[PDB]
Symmetry: D3
Subunit: 322 residues, 6 copies
C-alpha cells in the first residue's frame, strides 16, 4: 500500500511522545486516518480500504498501553469496514473515513469539556487538589472549578521520568490557578493537607482498575489511607473492551535513557538494569469515582460503560483486519 | 571566640550536602570539634571551653532534621563540660575533646558494621530488596548478606530531588550486587516482586516513628500493603531524646532549585510555589523492625533505647550551653 | 399567585420537623400539591399550572438534604407539566395533579411494606439488631422479622440532638419487640454483641454513598470493623438523580438550640460555636446491602437504580420551572 | 407418580456426594429429568407433567446450597410448564423435557470451556496459582493456561474433610501441571509465593458474595491481605436468584462421620459435638473478579447477571409446584 | 470504727459524680483519709489503723472503673501499713497518713501540669483538636498550647449522657480558646477537619488499652481511619496494676435515669431496657501516644510504667486488708 | 564418648513426635541430661562434662523450631559449664547437672499452672473460646477458667496433618468442658460466634512474632478481622534469644507421608510435591496479649523478656560447645 507521510510522521511522534496524553494520541490517529483518506491516490474502493487497514496497523503499533488509540481506529474503521462491505464506491468510502474521523475528534473535545463540567461540581471552594502527570481530562475539571470562582490550589507532582508535571504546573498557573509543585516522593507528606485527588487514565478495565502514569497507584493508595477522594477523569473511550474477555493490559516499558540520559548511562556498569514502566495499575477499591462524559460512576460500573458501548464489537475481529 | 577554618568549612559542607547521610555528618561534626581542640591557640581552659561551645553551636545550626549531628556534639561536649567543671586544666580539657571525638567516630564505624552483621541474618538467599536514598547502615546490611554468598538483587529508587539513589546504585554494583534502578513512582508496581525493604534513618522518635528521606513513608506504606518486611537500619544515635518530652522533629525544607534548576525556575511564573521537604515521617505500624548495633527491636522499643542511653541528659541543658 | 393554607402549613411543619422522616415528608409534599389542586379556584389551566409551580417551589425550599421530597414533587409535576403542555383543560389538569399525587403516596406505602418483607429474610432468629434514628423503612424490616416469629432484640440509639431514638424505642416496644436503649457513644461498645445493623436513608448517591442521620457513618464504620452486616433500607425515591452529573448533596445545618436549649446557650461565651449537621455521609465500602422495593442491591448498584428510573429527566429543567 | 429408578439413583448419589461439584450435580439433575421423560409410560400429558414435578422435587431435596441444581431444574421445568399449559400433547411435552435437559447439559459444558478461555488470559507465564477443593470451572482455567504454553504451578489445598484436593492434584498432574500439595492451614504461609488465587462457586448472591467449599473465605481473606488476585470461575447458573429478594443461602451441614470416621467417633464422650459445614461465605471485598461464560465482572455485578437472566422468574412460583 | 463524716460525704459525692474526673476522685480519696487521720479520736495505733482500713474500704467501694482511686488509697495505705507494722506510735502513724495523703495530692497536681507541658509540644500552631468528656489532663495540654501562643481551636463533643462536654466547652472558652461544640454522633463527620485528638483516661491496662468515657473508642477508631493522631493525656496512677496478672477492668454501669430522666422513664413499657455504661475500651492500635508526667510513650509501653512503679505490690494483699 | 540408652530414646521420640508439645520436649530433654548424669560411669569431671556436651548435641539436633528445647539444654548446661570451669569435682558436677535439670522441670510445671491462673482472668462466663493444636499452656487457661465456674465452650480445630486437635478435644471434654470440633478450614466461618482465641507457642521472636503450629497465623488473621482477642499462652522459655541479633527461626519441614500416607503417595504422579511445614509465623499486630508466668504482656514486650532473661548469654558460645 501507498501510505502518506503524515501517517508515518504521526506514528513516529506518538512513539517518541512528542504527541502524548491518551486522548490526544487517539485524536492524532483519527486525524492521520483522515489525511490518508484525503490524500489517497487510490482508484478502486479496495485500494483505499487496503491503505486504511495498513495505516491503522501502523498506528496501533506505536504505544500499546492506552486503549484510547485503538478505540479511535475502531471508531473509524468499523464504519469504513461496513461501508466497504456494503459495496460502497470510492468517494463514499473516502468520505466515510474522513467523516468518522472528524466525528471522533469532535466527540473527544466535547467529552473532555463535559467531564470538566461534571467533575467541577465535586470541587468545593477552598479545596486543595493533588494531581499526577498531565491529563487534559483532569485539568478540565480543575480549570472549570476555578472558572466557577472557587479558590483552589493545585498540588502537582513532577511525574518522573518524563516530567509531565512541568506541563501541568505551567498550564494551570497560566489560567491563574495557584500551583504547589513537589517531587512524587512527597505525595504522602502532603496528603494530609489535600482535600481531593484528580487524575486521568490511559485504560480502564472491566473490573474498575485504572491504568495511568507510573505513580498513580501510590498516590491513590495514600489518598485512601487518608480518606481523600480519588477521582478519575476519563472519556468513555479510555475503557478497554478486550478486558471484558480476560485480556490483560500491557504495561509499556520505555527507553532507560528517559531515566538516565545516554551520556551518563553509558558510564554505568553492566550489572545495573534501569526499568522504566510508563504506567501502573490502580485497583478499584482505591477509586471513589470515575468521571466520564456520561456522568459519575463508581469504578465497578466500568463494566456497564463497556457492555453498553463496546461489547457488541468483541464477537468480530478488529476492523482493520483480514 | 577564635574558631578554626575547618569548623566553618565543615558547617558549610554539611549545609550544602556535599557531606551528607546522617551518620557521616555526625562524624564530621565530631571531627570538626576534634580539630578545633587540636589547633586551638587558647591558653586558659575557659578560652578553649568557649571555642568548643561556639563551634558546637555553629555545627548544630547546619541541618536540623537528623538528630545524629546533635547527639555527636553532645557525646563530646557532655564529657568536655564535666571535665571543665571538674576544674580540668588546658591540656586535660583539649584531650578530653579530642578523645571523646575519636571515640564517637570509632563507635559510629563499629555500630554500622555490626548493623551489617545483624541485619544480614534477616536477608535470605534469592531475596529481592528494595531500598531508598543512600544509607550506609542499610547498605552495610545488603553488602554483608551478599558477602555471605546469598544471591540478592537490589531495587534502588532514584530518590528525587537530589538523586542519592545514583550513589547507591553505583556503590552496590561496585561490590558485585545486581541492581535494578527505578524512579520513586515505581515503588508500588515493584512491591509485588520485592521480598524485603531496607532503609536508613535520620531520627527516630520515642514512639517508634522514623524520619528519613522524603518518600520513605510511601515505600513503607505499600510495603505494609503487600506484607513485605520493612526493616530500618539505624545506629542508636539516630534516636531522638527530645521527643521523650514531647518535642516534634523539624522537617528540613531545602532550596527549590534542587527541584527546578535556577536557569529554568526563574522563567516560571510567581504563582507556582516549589516545596522541597527533605524528609517525611513513617509511622511505627509500618515498620517490622529497627536494626541497631544492640540488636533487633520492634519500632515501639525505641523508647527503651532512649530511656536507657539518653534520658538522663534531658534534666540538664545542652552541653554547649551557658 | 394564590396558595392554599395547607401548602404553607405543610411547608412550616417540614421546616420545624413536626413532620419528619424522609419518606414521610415526601408523602406530605405530594399531599400538599394534591390539596392545592383539590381546592384551587383557578378557572383556566394556565392559572392552576402556575399555582402548582409555586406550591412546588414553596415545598422544595423547606429542607434540602432528603432527595425524597424533590422526587415526590417531580413525580407529580412531570405528569402535571406534560398534561399542561399537551393541552389539558382545567379539570384534566386538576385530575392529573390529584392522581399523580395519590399514585406517589400509595407507591410509597407499598414500597415500605415490600422493603420490610425483603429485608426481613436477612434477619435470623435470635438476631440482635442495632439501628439508628427513626426510619420507617428500617422499622418495616424489624417489625416484619418479628411477625415471622424470629426472636429478635433491637438496640436503639437515642440519636442526638433531636432524640428520634425515643420514637423508635416506643414504636418497636409497642409491637412486642424487646429494646435496648443506649446513647450514640455506646455503639462500638455494643457492636460486639450485635448481629446486624439496619438503618434508613435520606439520600443515596450515584457512587453508592448513603446520607442519613448524623452518627450513621460512625455506626457503619464500627460495624465494618467488627464484620457486622450494614443494611440500609431505602425506597428508590431516596436515590439522588443530580449526583449522576456531579452534584454534591447539601448537608443540612440546623439550629444550635436543638443541641443547647436557648435558655442555656444565651449564657455561654461568644467564642463557643454550636455546629448541628443533621446528616452525615457513609461511604459504600461500609454498606453490605441496600434493600429497595425492587430488591437487594450492593451499594454500587445505586447508579443502576438512577439510570433506569431518573436519568431521563436530567436533560430537562425541573418540572416546576418556567 | 411412577418415578424411574434413575431419578432415585441420581438423588441418592447427589446426597452421598458420589456425584459432586456444583455444575456436575446440575447436569446430573437435568439428565435425570431427561430420562424420566424418555422412559415415562404416561398416556396423558397431565400424567407426564406430574411425574416431572415429582422428580424435580426429589432432585431438589438432595443438597441445598448449590443453586446450580434448582437452576437446572428450572431451566427444564419452566419450558415443560409453558408447553403443558399451552396445551401440548403427550409427545410434544416429552420432547420439550428431553430437549430442554439436553440444552442445559450442552450449555453447561460450553460455558465451562469458555470460562477456561476467558480466565486463562488472566494467567501469565510463571504464575504460581493457589486453588481450593475441586472445581471444574477453576480447573478449566488452569488447564487452558498451561495449553497456551504458560509455565504454571498450582498449589492445591487438600480440602478437608472430604479431601477433594486429592482429585484436583491428580487431575492437574495428569495434564502436565506441577502441583504443590498442602494442608488447608498452610494457605497463609504460602500466600507470599502465590501470584493468583482461582477457585469455584456453588452459589453467588445478589450482593456479590460467593458461597463455596468450607475454607474458601479464609484463603480469600489472606489473599487480600497479601494483594493476591482472587478470581472466582463460575457459570451464570451459579448465580442465586432468590437472593435478589432477600433470601439467605442455606449452608449444608453434613454428617459428622466425614470428619471423624464412625468407628472412632462412637468412642468419643457425648460432650464433644462435631460440626461440619460444607460451605462458607466469602464477601465481595475479597474477590477481584468473577469469570463467567459471558466475561469478567466485578463481584458487585452479580446483580446484573441476575437481573438480566433470572429476575423475570421471581413473580412466579417454582415451575415444579402445584 | 469511728468514721468521720468527711469520709462518708466524700464517698457519697464520688458515687453521685458531684465529685468526678479520675484524678480528681483520687485526690479526694487521699484527702478524705488525711482528714480521718487529722480528726481521729483514736488512743492506740491499732485503733487509728483500723479506722484507716475501714475508710479506705468505704472509699474503694464508690466507683470501680478508674484505677486512680485504688492507687491513691494504696499510696497512702502502703505507707500507713509499713509504719503500723514497723511499730510506729499513735502520732507517728497519724503523721504518716496525713503526709502520705499530702504527697499524693501534690504529686497529682504537678503531674497534670507536667503532662500539659509535654503534650503542648506536640500541638502546633493552627491545630484543630478534638477532645471528648472533661479531662483535666487533656485540658492542661490544650491550655498550655494556647499559652505558648499557638492559635488552636477545639472541637468538644457533648459527651452524653452526663454532658461533661459542657464543662469542657465553658472551661476552654474561659481561657481564650475557641470551641466548636458538637454531638457525639458528629465526630466522624468532623474528623476530616481535625488535626489532633487529645483525650484522657480512667484506667490504662498492661497491654496498652485505655478505658475512658463512653464513646472514646469510637472517636479513636475514626481518628485512625483518618490518620489523625490520637494522644491520651494520663498520669502514671491511671495505670492499672492488677491487669499485669490478667485482671479485667470492670465497666461501671450507671443508673438508667441519667439517660432518660425518672419522670419520662416511668412512663415507658417494661420491654425497653436502658443500658448506661460509663466507659469503653480503646485498643492500643488506635492510640499514637500516651503523655504521662514522665514523658511520651507508645501505648505498648504501659507495661513498663507498671513494671517499674507498681508491679512490686502484686505479691502482697491490698494494704487496707486484714 | 559414652551415652546412655535414655538419651538416644528421648531423641528418637522427639523426632518421631511420640513426645511433642514445645514445653514437653523441653522437659524431656532436661530429663535426658538428668539421667545421663544419674547413670554415667565417668570417673573424672572432664569425662562427664564431655558426655553432657555430647548428649546435649544429640538432643538439640532433634527438632529445630521450638526454642524451648535449646533453652532447657542451656538452663542445665550454663550451670554445668560454670561448675566445671570453676573446678567442681565429679560428684559436684553430677549434682549440678541433675539439679539444674530438676529445677527446669519444676519451673516448667509451675510456669504452666501460673499461666493458667493469669489467663483465666481474661476468660468470662459464657465465653466461646477457639483454640488450635494441643498446647498445655493454652489448656491450662481453659481448664482453670472452667474450674472457676465460668460456663465456657471450646471450639477445637482438628489441626492437620497430625490431628493434635483430637488430643485437645478428648482432654478438654474429659475435664467436663463442652467442645465443638471443626476442621481448620471452618475457622472463619465460626469466628463470628467466637469470643476469644487461646493458642500456644513454640518460639516467640524479639519483634513479637509467634511461631506456632501451622494454621495459627490464619486463625489469628481472621480473629483480628472480627475483633476477637488473640491470646498466646507461653512460658518465658518459649522466647527466642538469638532473634535478638537477627537470627531467623527455621520452620520445620516434616515428612510428606504425614499428609498423604505412604501407601497412597507412592501411587501419585511424580510432578506432585507434598510440602508439610510444621509451623507458621503470626505477626505481633494480630496478637492481643502474650500470657507468660510473669504476667500479661503486649507482643512487642517480647524483647523485654529476652533482654532481662537471655541477652546476657549471647556474647558467649553455646554452653555445650568446645
Ligand atoms: N522465620 C522467621 N523467624 C523470625 N521471625 C519471622 C520469621 N518469618 C517471619 N517473621 C516475622 O513475622 C512477621 C511475618 O509476617 P508478614 O509481615 O505478614 O510477612 C514479620 O513481622 C517478621 O519479622
Ligand atoms: O487523556 P488525558 O486525560 O490528557 O491523559 C490521560 C493520561 O495519558 C497520559 O499518558 P502518557 O503521557 O501518554 O504516557 C497520562 O498517563 C495521563 O494521565
Ligand atoms: O546514616 P546513613 O544510614 O548513611 O543515612 C541515613 C539517612 O540520611 C540521609 O539523609 P540526607 O541525605 O543527609 O538528607 C538519608 O535520609 C538516609 O536514609
Ligand atoms: O424515610 P424513613 O425510612 O422513615 O427515614 C429515613 C431517614 O430520614 C430521617 O431524617 P429526619 O428525621 O427527617 O431528618 C432519618 O435520617 C431517617 O433515617
Ligand atoms: O483525670 P482527668 O484527666 O480529669 O479525667 C479522666 C477521665 O475520667 C472521667 O471519668 P468520669 O467523668 O469521672 O466518669 C472521664 O472519663 C475522663 O476522660
Ligand atoms: O508447650 P505447649 O503449650 O504444650 O505447646 C506449644 C506448641 O507446641 C506444639 O508443637 P508440636 O506439636 O510439638 O509440633 C504446638 O505448636 C503447640 O501450640
Ligand atoms: K486530607
Ligand atoms: K512481595
Ligand atoms: K466474634
Amino acid at each position: 500500500a501507498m501510505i502518506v507521510k503524515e501517517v508515518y510522521e504521526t506514528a513516529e511522534k506518538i512513539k517518541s511522545m512528542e504527541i502524548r496524553g491518551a486522548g490526544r494520541i487517539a485524536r492524532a490517529a483519527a486525524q492521520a486516518l483522515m489525511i490518508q483518506a484525503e490524500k489517497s491516490k487510490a482508484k478502486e474502493p479496495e485500494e483505499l480500504w487496503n491503505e486504511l487497514k495498513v495505516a491503522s496497523k501502523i498506528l496501533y503499533n506505536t504505544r500499546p498501553t492506552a486503549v484510547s488509540l485503538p478505540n479511535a481506529l475502531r471508531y473509524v474503521m468499523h464504519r469504513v469496514k461496513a461501508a466497504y462491505l456494503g459495496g460502497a464506491d470510492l468517494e463514499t468510502l473516502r468520505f466515510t473515513a474522513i467523516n468518522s474521523a472528524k466525528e471522533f475528534i469532535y466527540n473527544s473535545e466535547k467529552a473532555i469539556e463535559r467531564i470538566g463540567e461534571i467533575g467541577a461540581k465535586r470541587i468545593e471552594d477552598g479545596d486543595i487538589i493533588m494531581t499526577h502527570c498531565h491529563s487534559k481530562a483532569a485539568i478540565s475539571v480543575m480549570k472549570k472549578a476555578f472558572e466557577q470562582g472557587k479558590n483552589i490550589k493545585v498540588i502537582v507532582t513532577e511525574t518522573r521520568p518524563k516530567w509531565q508535571g512541568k506541563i501541568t504546573a505551567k498550564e494551570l498557573a497560566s489560567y491563574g490557578i495557584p500551583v504547589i509543585y513537589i517531587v512524587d516522593s512527597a505525595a504522602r507528606h502532603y496528603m494530609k493537607m489535600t482535600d481531593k485527588v484528580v487524575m486521568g487514565a490511559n485504560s480502564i478495565t472491566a473490573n474498575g482498575a485504572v491504568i495511568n502514569k507510573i505513580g498513580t497507584s501510590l498516590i491513590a493508595l495514600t489518598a485512601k489511607e487518608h480518606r481523600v477522594w480519588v477521582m478519575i477523569a476519563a472519556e468513555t473511550y479510555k475503557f478497554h473492551p478486550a478486558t471484558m474477555l480476560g485480556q490483560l493490559v500491557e504495561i509499556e516499558m520505555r527507553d532507560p535513557t528517559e531515566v538516565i540520559p545516554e551520556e551518563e548511562l553509558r558510564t554505568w556498569p553492566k550489572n545495573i538494569e534501569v526499568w522504566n514502566p510508563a504506567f501502573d495499575v490502580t485497583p478499584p477499591e482505591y477509586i471513589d469515582v470515575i468521571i466520564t462524559e456520561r456522568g459519575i460512576i463508581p469504578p465497578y460500573a466500568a463494566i456497564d460503560i463497556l457492555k453498553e458501548e463496546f461489547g457488541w464489537a468483541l464477537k468480530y475481529k478488529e476492523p482493520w483486519e483480514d
